[PDB]
Amino acid sequence: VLEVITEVECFLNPEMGDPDENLRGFSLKLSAQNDFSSDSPERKMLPCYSTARIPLPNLNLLMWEAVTVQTEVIGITSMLNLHAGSQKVHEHGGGKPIQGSNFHFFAVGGEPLEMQGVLMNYRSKYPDGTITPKNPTAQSQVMNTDHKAYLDKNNAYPVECWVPDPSRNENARYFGTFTGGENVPPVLHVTNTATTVLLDEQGVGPLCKADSLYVSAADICGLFTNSSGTQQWRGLARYFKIRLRKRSV
Amino acid sequence: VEVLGVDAITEVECFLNPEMGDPDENLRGFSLKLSAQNDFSSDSPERKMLPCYSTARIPLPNLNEDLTSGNLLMWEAVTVQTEVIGITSMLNLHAGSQKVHEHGGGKPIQGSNFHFFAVGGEPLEMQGVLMNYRSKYPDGTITPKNPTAQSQVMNTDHKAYLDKNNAYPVECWVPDPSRNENARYFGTFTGGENVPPVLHVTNTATTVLLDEQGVGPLCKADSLYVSAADICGLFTNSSGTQQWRGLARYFKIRLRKRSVK
Amino acid sequence: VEVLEVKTGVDITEVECFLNPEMGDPDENLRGFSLKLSAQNDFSSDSPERKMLPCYSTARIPLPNLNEDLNLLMWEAVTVQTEVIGITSMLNLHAGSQKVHEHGGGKPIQGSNFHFFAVGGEPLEMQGVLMNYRSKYPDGTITPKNPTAQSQVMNTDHKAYLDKNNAYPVECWVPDPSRNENARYFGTFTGGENVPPVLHVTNTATTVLLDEQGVGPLCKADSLYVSAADICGLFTNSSGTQQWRGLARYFKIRLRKRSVKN
Amino acid sequence: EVLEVKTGVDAITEVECFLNPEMGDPDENLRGFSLKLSAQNDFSSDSPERKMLPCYSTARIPLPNLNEDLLMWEAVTVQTEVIGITSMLNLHAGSQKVHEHGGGKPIQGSNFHFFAVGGEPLEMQGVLMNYRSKYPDGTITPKNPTAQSQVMNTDHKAYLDKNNAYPVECWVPDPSRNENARYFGTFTGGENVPPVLHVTNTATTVLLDEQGVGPLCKADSLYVSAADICGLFTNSSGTQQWRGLARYFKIRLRKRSVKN
Amino acid sequence: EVLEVKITEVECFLNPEMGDPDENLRGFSLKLSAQNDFSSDSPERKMLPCYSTARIPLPNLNLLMWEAVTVQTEVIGITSMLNLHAGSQKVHEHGGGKPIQGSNFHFFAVGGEPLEMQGVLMNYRSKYPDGTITPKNPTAQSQVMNTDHKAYLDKNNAYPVECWVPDPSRNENARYFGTFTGGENVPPVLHVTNTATTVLLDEQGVGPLCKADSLYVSAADICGLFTNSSGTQQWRGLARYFKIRLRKRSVKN
Ligand SMILES: [Cl-]
Ligand SMILES: [Cl-]
Ligand SMILES: [Cl-]
Ligand SMILES: [Cl-]
Ligand SMILES: [Cl-]
Incomplete structure (x- = not known):
């Protein structure tokens, strides 16, 4: 890398599972109480990481260097619809807000995001279309160094199986917050004044290898509680604006 | 709206009223009672149930005697002081609100809230996103045209200017981070049944x-645009019905004269 | 008032005040508390009793x-140290409060709270806003005159000076961000049934x-004005009834002499 | 009154100590707890037992x-933290189950975390929840209180001059005095408040x-003060007790020239 | 003692030691008991999370000594708590599983010698199981501060988290950081980023300064309680990553 402008932008859609053509941005209803010995979750129940190659x-060596990113979660006010589908909070009351466990994560790199597998339950049987840790053992519940993957397919790597790998990702920056619990309030900020x-x-x-910039996200906002009591993940798209400059390699 | 050398500073003051729905003449600042449990395929919210963005053009x-000159002057917005007005009104627990328990005081306003403002030199630009694309929105509202399932995530068709007061429902629209090159916007959404409202007032804070x-x-055609949404939470009537409560937002914007090509 | 330089000499006075809260004080024993809260009055018949309504506290110092000949000198407030007094009194869970469960301790004070102070060279300028414009307020209170529906959002008619102690109900009035050019004010409202009080004391914090x-x-008529509201939360009696609890606020203000033009 | 920092050999010193909490200690085995909490006493008949009332901790170092003809020790920094925060991860001993087949209920609820460093005893102001409270022998509490003692009564001045005597519920640091002390306190109230406690040897005040x-240390004495009520322990029966923990202090001092 | 500066990186993933009640539930404790009288409190080994430590x-180099300059650290696998389909009690009828929540502790240390620890107990009469190293000759004063209870974190999976804290009166040659959050319904809040250096x-x-050419890393990352369908609860812990930059420092003999 020797010494020494352009802007690119992307709206990256969430991959919450999309159980039918009308419920884009939601997951399938959550199952509960599967014994660790028989845990076979359906594909459409599993939120996955989002990624796009831009x-x-x-240029011919000159390389694009990512310098700043502006990002935010898009459509946060959509959760002020308490009239459609959600269980009443009490008799004569309005609908129950989306709430509960959430994960807000983004990454910008010159190559795919590098991930490390960790499982709640190593004996989980993951469905076709998902990429999950190979040859899991009890050690896959803590740290098992076999579970290395690239975020190289959109809507494939379940969020519950994978984290950004802090032992790699030399050529990317990543940021994520997990907040767990049934009554966690979503707290989301929008502003066009904030730059990372x-x-x-x-x-x-x-530095963008093969003239390619990789954006990665997961924005599980919480659980939507149907009138019946069934629960579904709700996700939102993430906007990125990346400022790049030419650098001599 | 009070609008008061080459280093001339103009201060623009205004109190922008909330637009929560105002279901009758006595419940200014409130929405109609919230419905619940409408199936996605038959979700027809009433007009007066839907808080909308507030906006005004000032x-x-x-600034320019000679419109033919090589350089023109434009008003440039340099700082804003803003706060939500009448937050103490929520210490009235004697009127209309369900008791917290037998012999108890009224239930405080609480739950999901959204506090948002923008200051720009052109209308705020907005992106549409829907909880439910099959929502049938009422006459009087402006909502995403020809929505699809993709409208529940990102659909680039849904672009609008916030160009009408009390028309754009907060639940359908967000400030568009892909535009607004000539505006600054700030918002926080906090969701949940029991979310406490947390609101600060001070004449010492400047953005x-x-x-x-x-x-x-830069104020295009000598026009300053203010936008706000201040849904404070839900008021719970003795019956158990819930209504959005909104409050006005004050703005004090300082402007200077910038020379442009 | 044209403001000139700070008058330096061999002479920065400090002044201090403990400002008592005005929560309603329903009898001789319940100083610092309101009357039991009523609930569920219809907006059309909402007549709160005076002793149920916390009011803004104010004192004139x-x-x-400073003038030998009626250029002049005025006192200028530079800094304030302020804190809420007796926060640890909420660790009394043996007196008066409802048990949290059978064989348990008393219920802590909790719920909606408001912590507000101001320091000005003149009375605090306030703006009226009402939950319910049809509220019938009791004798001894000063509340918005000829309110309309618009009084529930912003009605610019409702301008008042905080010119009387224990008269301006907290639920009716906010500091006016469009005035108070000669005062600094700071407030936080936290609303909700189960909101925990969070209060900090330290003698190291200066505003x-x-x-x-x-x-x-600038103390234009040789007066300094301190204003406060410190509703800490609701006290829940064994009976289920609720009362606001307030605490005094300490102020220590550093003053200097400022030259101004006649 | 205050001149230059004196440098030289032996112009700097550090002192450290662990101040035990004073939660009431209801028997020889429940050191660091209070007696079980009563509830619902009428304001007119409120007689808390001594062992139920946590008190401020204080010590003279x-x-x-140093010689007076003035040289004085000046407290520059303090490192402090609460000791034994992980003990609250014992959910097997004595605490009410959260539900059938569940673990014990964690310590939680109202808490107060307070410390002071001064060159004289901490100066305190009295405020009472209930001016009619009848406090027990062995406590020092606002003397001859009135209704005003529930808000601000300027008669209630005391020095924190006795360990395990000044109940926390009766007294606060007096911001109108303590010219020669620094104090820091946070009160968080409520039945379900989570304890949140940080430890680190890299944080300096x-x-x-x-x-x-x-x-500035009068008569070559340094005064440390604390209150660390961590929350309420819930017994199997439902009875509740305050739980407190010790506080560590490490104080760096330097010599300062002063004119009397 | 410490003179002029004369760079090397080491990294480690340190597993949590939550109790591991059977070969399948690595990263979990045994179900928690409740309501033992203080006079008969005999916790099982596998129910007690312990501090983790590794010597690197x-x-x-021989004086010259290795000097630890920076650390990047991260809890690993925080998204695994989005699995609400495996084994957790439903939040209500037709609902998803209950998140991991409740009391949690997040702690790490970097030193040139073992972590120095101070013993404090909830209950001094607690009878700890074989394989654990806990306060010796405890008294009622062991429920507050008892200066007898000094120990080195000199063994992995032995020092129960509930018995021991880092000693602020020692650890001159180490840096430690910990947050305890207690309560029934406390939400886990965890951040990941590769942009944060301590x-x-x-x-x-x-x-x-690495005495005897050894670097010591220490952790405890109790994320909260997992609630089984039956109602029984287990601690859940996760591994901690460490990346430490070291440089050579000249010292006097
Ligand atoms: Cl793998
Ligand atoms: Cl559209
Ligand atoms: Cl008026
Ligand atoms: Cl006294
Ligand atoms: Cl020992």
Whole structure:
């Protein structure tokens, strides 16, 4: 990497499971109380990480360096609809707000996000279309160094199976907050005044290999509680605006 | 709206009223009672049940005697002081609100809330997202045209200017982070049945409107745009019915004269 | 008032005040509490009793005139140290409060709270806003005159000076952000049934009262005004009835002499 | 009164201590707990037992003797934290089950975390929930209180001059005095409040005022004060007791020249 | 003692020691008991989470000593708590499983010697099981501060988290950071980022110095309670990653 502008943007859709053509942005209803010895969750019940590869102007070595990102979760006010489908809070009361466990995560890199597998239950039998830890053992419930993967397929890597790998990701920046619990309030902020700098302490940002920029996200907002009492994950899309400059390699 | 050398500062003050629905003449600042449990396939919210974005265009003094000149002057918005007005009104637990228990006081306003403002030199630009794309919205509202299942996530068709007061339902629209190059917007959504409202007042806080290059919103055709949504939470009537409560937002915006090409 | 330089000399006075709260004080024993809260009055017949309504506290601190000939000198407020007094009194869970469960301790004070202070060179300027414009307020209260539905959002008619102690109900009035050019105010409202009180004491915290140009509130008529509201939450009696509980607020204000033009 | 910091050999010292909590200690085995809490006493007949009332902790630390013809020790920094926060992860002993087949109920609810460093005893102001409370022998509480003692009564001034005597519910640090002390307290009230406690040997509180002057130690004595009521322990029966923990202090001091 | 500075990186994933009640429930404790009288409180080994520790040997440089300058650390697998289909009690009829929630402790340390610990007990009369190292000759004063209870974190899976805390009166040659959050319904809140570095230099710019060419990492990451369908509860813990930058420092003999 030697010394030494353009902007790209993306709306990245969430991958919550989409149990039918009308329920884009939701998961299938949650099952409960499967014994660890017989836990076979359906594909459409499992939120997955989102990713997109963004092609950049080819340059000939000059490389695009990501310098800043602006990002926010899109449609947060949609949760002020308490008239459609949600269980009443009490008799004559309005609908129950989306609430409970949530995960808000994004990454910007010059290559796919590197992940480490960890499982609640190693004996989980994951469905076709999902990519999950291979040859899991009891150690897969703590740290098992076999479970390395690239975030190289959209709507494939279940959020519950994978985390950003802090032992890799030399050429990406990632940020995530997990908040667990049945009554957790969603707290989401919007502003066009907030920028994250992507430069390390030596002043270098993600360098885009094969003229490619990779954005990654997961934005599980909480659980939607139907009138029947059934629960579904709700997700929202994440906007990215990335400022890049030419750097000489 | 009070609108008061080359270093001339104009201060624009205004109190923007909330638009929560106002279901009768006595419940200004409240919505109609919330319905619940409408199947997605038959969800027809009443007009007066839907809080909408508040907005106003504030005309500014004309700056340019000669419209033919190489350079023109524009009002540039440099700072805003803002706060929500009448937050103490929620200490009235004697009127209309369900008792917390037998012999107890009234239930405080609480639950999901949204506190949002914008200051720009053109209308706020908005992106539509829906809980439920099959929602049938009522006459008087402006809501995403020809929504699809993709409207429940991101559908780039749904672009609008916040160009009408009490028309754009908060539940359908967010500020568009892909536009608004000539506006600053700030919002926080806090969801949940029991969320406590937390609101601060002080005449000592100022938000700077200058971007990275030190440039504020530039007021196009001498027009300053203020936008707000202040849903404080849900009021619970003795019956158990719930209504949105909103409050007005004050703005004090300082502007200077910028030369442009 | 044209503001000139700070008058330096061999002479920064400090003044201090403990400002008692005005929660309603329903009898001789219940100083610091309101009357039991009523519930479920229809908006059309809402007549709260005076002793049920917390009011803004205010005191005027008199200062010596500085002018040998009626250029002049005014006292300028530079800083304030302030804190809520007796926060630990809520650790009394043996007196009066409803058991949390059988064989358990008393229920803590909790729920909606408001913590507000101001320091000005003149009375606090307030703006009226009502939950219910049809509320019939009791003798001894000063509340918005000729309210309309618009009084439930913003009605610019409702301007008042905080010119009387224990008269302006907290539920009717907020500091006016469109006035108070000669005062600094700070408030946080936290609403809800089960809100925990969170209160900090420290003698290391100073609020600077100086504006953008380094100018504090000026005591135009040789008076300093301190204003407060400290509703800590609701006390729940064994019976189920609820009362507001308030606590006094301490102020210590650093003053200097400021030159101004006649 | 205050001149230059004196440097030289032996112009700096550090002192440390662990101050035990004073939660009431209802028997020889329940050190660090209170007696079970009563409830619903009428204000007119409120007679709390001594062992039910947590009190402020205080200790005097002697410093190397300095000469008066003035040189004084100046407190510059304090490192402090609450000791034994992980003991609350014992959910097997004595605590009511959260539900059938469940673990014990964690300690939770109203808490107060307070410390002070001064060159004289902490100065306190009295405020009462109920001015008619009848406090027990062995406690020092607001003397001859009135209805005003429920808000602010300026008669209630005391020095924190006795360990395990000044009940926390009766007294606060007096912000109108303590010219020669720094204090820091947080009260969080409510039945379900979670304890939140941080430990780290990398956090330092600076005790210097805006002029760069720390507490000055009169007669070569340093005074530490604390209250760390962590919350309520719920027994199997439903009875509740306060739980407190010790507090560590590490105080760095330097010599300061002063003119009497 | 400590003179001029003369760079190497080491990394570790340290497993949690939550009790591991059977070969399938690695990362969990045995179900919690409740309501033992203080006079008859005999917790099983597998029910007690313990501090984790690893010693990392470094090249023998001989004085010159290895000096720990920075640490990046992260709890690993926080998203696994989004599995609400495996084994958790339903929140209500037709509902999803109950999240892990309740009392949690998140702690780490980097030192040039074993972590120095201080013993404090909920109940001094607690009778601890074989394989655990707990306060010796405890008294009622062991429920507050009893200075007898000093120990080195010198063994992995032995020192129960409920018995021991880092000693603020020692650990001159280590840096430690911990937060305890107690309560029935406390929400786990965990952040991941590869952009966060902790500086380990003291006031004089000296990091921990690796006595006998050993670096010591210590942790406890009790995430909260898992509630089984039956109502029984188990602690859940997760591994902690460490990446430590070290430099050579000249010292006097
Ligand atoms: Cl794998
Ligand atoms: Cl549209
Ligand atoms: Cl009026
Ligand atoms: Cl006294
Ligand atoms: Cl020991």
